[PDB]
């Protein structure tokens, strides 16, 4: 009941690889307190979102700042994928890009693709 | 250093008796996505969350962000009190002060009691 909007899966899976890789060439927050505070400084660039959290509650008020403070947030259906993608051998509910290290251009472009879905 | 959730009672009553009166000469945020909006943009005065909402989860995010935005918060121990507070027939979650109207004296005498609760 916090999913907002429907992603289509090939954007998503794009947007989970770029996840991956930006990684090692920038810098990401990690969990759902991480990602409040850096969509609150208005350092998210983009932030990532779990359909599946348990419980859902935990990240119900993430679409509505990252929407008040402008942030583009995308949603992926499977929170072992999303943590995967951050690294890690157990799941993850949410995670935000601070620094796309080189990956500036290919963020602008999914940035730009999920700023151009239907909401 | 805030032990939030060691607030003296008649702290926390003095807060639900200012909260009923403010609703009728002021302005209340009832619900924990208005206040979370109210917390963002700095309007919110005084936020009060119940600390036995179910789930915890719900309000999690809230502490959090009015430590970020220098928000004077304060837990009360029963959600059916701040229902009743706000006027709400279901229990309350969160809620927050945007202003006090005429009860000047009573929230600015509160809010520098809970200040003392701090450092
Ligand atoms: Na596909
Ligand atoms: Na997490
Ligand atoms: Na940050
Ligand atoms: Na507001
Ligand atoms: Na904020």
């Known amino acids: 009941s916090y999913v907002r909007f429907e992603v289509p899966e090939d954007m998503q899976n794009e947007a989970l690889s770029l996840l991956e890789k930006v ?43 990252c929407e008040e403070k402008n942030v583009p947030y995308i949603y992926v259906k499977s929170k072992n994928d999303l943590g995967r993608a951050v690294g890690r051998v157990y799941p993850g509910a949410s995670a935000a890009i601070i620094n796309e290290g080189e990956l500036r251009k290919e963020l602008g472009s999914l940035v730009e693709k999920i700023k151009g879905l239907q909401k």
Chains 1, 2 share one sequence.
């Open 23 to 65: 990684r090692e060439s920038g810098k990401v927050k990690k969990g759902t307190n991480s990602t409040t505070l850096a969509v609150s400084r208005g350092l998210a660039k983009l932030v990532y979102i779990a359909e599946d959290v348990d419980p859902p509650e935990i990240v119900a008020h993430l679409p509505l700042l």
